[PDB]
Symmetry: D2
Subunit: 115 residues, 4 copies
């Protein structure tokens, strides 16, 4: 429950369901290593990506596959995906919610970080 | 200028053109009195709303007619309009740009205040 | 549970707690009548504003008192409040979540509407 | 231009000045190759990144160094940078403006594509 991703559809005003999400962690060699992945639920939320144990300090990238989402709705969107890159757990364990609000030519993303 | 309004469309990735914008100033009896208005240009901008002489300190409301905009495009909108309420404060020479980025179920607005 | 308001702080990445929220409904005479009010909880959410019975079809305005919020944190923000105006229940009862993400000079608002 | 990047600061309500921006183009081996870069101007804009002749169809990544920007202002940021990944498509004469509105824990980005 240390990492949750939530995705909303700004065109319909609904959760964005079945959106693929891939998480990567920067490795010693400076490459992006696969870390976890999943798909948003009917609530637009993706829980269970990781555990407190596995979610160590590091630089992480959360890639939200927005293009596939929009194309499945008949929209040709601008972005390939939405990417969120951040250092995590540098001051000890935290809980992170990464939210993205999606439109065809735009998105917003915010993080809520709690102890 | 001392006041400009800019409106963008997040669905098509373009300026929002011909959007009605109304500006009001708060009167002593607490009511909103018409102050200025117009329609956004081909660039999505509305210039020439007021002059330095007219734009005195006070509380202003900028109402952007987002519902009509979405109606013209055949897209079902949530909001009646977008409203931005702010106090104009003299603090050296300032220009206010009110920008709004529109989606059918969401909008973002920011103020850019520069000398 | 037909109306919920959620407010997030984009400066700290946390829920916006104890934020005053006032809801109004447009009356026959075209004036804004008080409808409900409350303050966000530790989760940044405001539940229990109304009931399915009281929340009839109409035009509603949700005013989020952002200025008071920011001033309590030592910030002099741009907006007086964030206003969200929308027609509700025109096609029958729905559940509405109105979210606002706050920064000193900017905000975004989105609605998630479910049946 | 065919490509412009604009960055705004939602905390102070101003252009984000002297922000580093790097543009990459996806190569055949799937790697990101440097394409163009610069620092935003006093208007928060970065012009002259590329020419029509150089800006061929392909996948591009625009990375805005938001962390350094927030560091210079003494404000604790969440993201390492903001990233915008998109496919450039020839479809009549197009100009791309990538805009980003920055907060310490959130950002919004939109594309404005015009002839
Ligand atoms: O969590 N939210 O409900 C919410 C609201 C507005 C927003 O702009 C965002 N965002 O940028 O991710 C998220
Ligand atoms: O440039 N702008 O005017 C502007 C306004 C609001 C926004 O949310 C954005 N954005 O997403 O980058 C840009």
């Amino acid at each position: 429950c240390p990492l949750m991703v939530k995705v909303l559809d700004a065109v319909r005003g609904s959760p964005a369901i079945n959106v693929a999400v891939h998480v990567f962690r920067k490795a010693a060699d400076d490459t992006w290593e696969p870390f976890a992945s999943g798909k948003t639920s009917e609530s637009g939320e993706l829980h269970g990506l990781t555990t407190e144990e596995e979610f160590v300090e590091g630089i992480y990238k959360v890639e939200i596959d927005t293009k596939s989402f929009w194309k499945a709705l008949g929209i040709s969107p601008f972005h390939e995906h939405a990417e969120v890159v951040f250092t995590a757990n540098d001051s000890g364990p935290r809980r992170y919610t990464i939210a993205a609000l999606l439109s065809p030519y735009s998105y917003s993303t915010t993080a809520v970080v709690t102890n």
